[PDB]
Write a protein that binds this ligand. Structure first.
Ligand SMILES: *[C@@H]1O[C@H](CO)[C@@H](O[C@@H]2O[C@H](CO)[C@@H](O[C@@H]3O[C@H](CO)[C@@H](O)[C@H](O)[C@@H]3O)[C@H](O)[C@H]2NC(C)=O)[C@H](O)[C@H]1NC(C)=O
Ligand SMILES: *[C@@H]1O[C@H](CO)[C@@H](O[C@@H]2O[C@H](CO)[C@@H](O)[C@H](O)[C@H]2NC(C)=O)[C@H](O)[C@H]1NC(C)=O
Length: 308
């Protein structure tokens, strides 16, 4: 449990079972992560309480391109290419939700650059689950509708950037010296001289399957998906992931941003929440079409309401 997840032996058998479609790395940023540390990162816990997306006749007939990138589609939205760090907490369900909400304020909500507070969601939605011990993406978006959230400016994410590297390029403190509990729920801003601006959605819905994902992304931008994390994913470095090896570590929520083809392999482009040192500058590609690790089973999304 305090034993390391990864080994040269493990990674070498992954690089041979995956046939070179993707690349795993032993001596990368997660070389020393413990089973306990890797499990904590995967905080999705709990058919759907949200109605299924209904596309209009016009949405349904759009001929979707062979490849798509949200940052390229909305180049005046600076939150889309930013990468989150959940830190040493099982908060992915809240961090992925808040990231896509920020993005959607720019693609739909008439607001170029607001960061919705992951920390507010994590601490104040007890409906959603148990904070840093995990929660439900679906209920995160229902809370954004029913109650609303404050910005990052009002309540900064309480947990600092940390590295699994013992000597980090960005100089962050090691994640090994940290084990955080659910923060206190606050009504006003951390700095009491900053006034509270409340942000709310008017509707929340669910996406299921490949067509739902591409069509929703194309019209309205990034949203929250979840998948099963296996030990081999922790060592991911490049290319299009598919599970070949290792035990289940839990469910993990991420932000979907695009799709494409790499040498005949169809993929999703995804923003993880483990900072820019991990994977492809914080992104990974995963196989598209076969619900790889269940990634196509359930997305969560909503439409933000323009302020004043
Ligand atoms: C809601 O309000 C409280 C503040 O009343 C926030 O909790 C506080 O979070 C800070 C981190 O910004 C904690 O400070 C840290 O303390 C540890 C040692 O205890 C130390 O390693 C660091 O140097 C750091 O200063 C603070 O202890 C904690 N206080 C209490 C009373 O809980 C909370 O994070 C806010 N909620 C949200 C969603 O932001
Ligand atoms: C994982 O931990 C090991 C040590 O426990 C790291 O390897 C050492 O790195 C230190 C500097 O931090 C150097 O003194 C040595 O070159 C290494 N020693 C041994 C025994 O290998 C390793 O780099 C850590 N990995 C990461 C990516 O942080």
């Amino acid at each position: 449990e305090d034993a390391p997840v990864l080994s040269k032996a493990f990674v070498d058998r992954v690089n041979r079972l995956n046939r070179g479609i993707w690349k795993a790395k032993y001596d990368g940023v997660m070389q020393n992560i413990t089973l306990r540390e890797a499990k904590r990162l995967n905080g999705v816990i709990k058919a759907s309480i949200l109605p299924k997306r209904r596309f209009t006749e016009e949405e349904a007939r759009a001929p979707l391109p062979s490849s798509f990138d949200s940052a390229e589609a909305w180049p005046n939205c600076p939150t889309i290419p930013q990468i989150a760090d959940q830190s040493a907490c099982g908060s992915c369900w809240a961090v992925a939700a808040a990231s896509a909400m920020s993005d959607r304020f720019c693609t739909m909500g008439g607001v170029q650059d607001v960061h919705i507070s992951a920390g507010d969601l994590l601490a104040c939605c007890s409906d959603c689950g148990d904070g840093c011990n995990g929660g439900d993406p679906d209920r995160a978006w229902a809370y954004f509708s029913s109650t609303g959230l404050v910005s990052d400016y009002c309540q900064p994410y309480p947990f600092p950037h940390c590295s699994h590297h013992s000597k980090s390029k960005n100089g962050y403190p090691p994640c090994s010296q940290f084990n955080f509990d659910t923060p206190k729920c606050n009504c006003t801003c951390d700095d009491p001289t900053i006034p509270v601006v409340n942000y709310r959605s008017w509707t929340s819905y669910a996406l299921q399957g490949e067509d739902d994902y591409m069509r929703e992304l194309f019209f309205r931008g990034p949203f929250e998906v979840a998948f099963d994390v296996y030990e081999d994913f922790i060592a991911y470095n490049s290319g299009v992931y598919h599970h070949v090896c290792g035990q289940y570590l839990g469910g993990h929520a991420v932000r979907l941003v695009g799709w494409g083809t790499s040498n005949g392999v169809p993929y999703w482009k995804i923003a993880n929440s483990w900072n820019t040192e991990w994977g492809m500058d914080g992104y990974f590609l995963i196989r598209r079409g076969s619900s790889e690790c269940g990634i196509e089973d359930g997305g969560s999304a909503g439409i933000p309401l323009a302020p004043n």
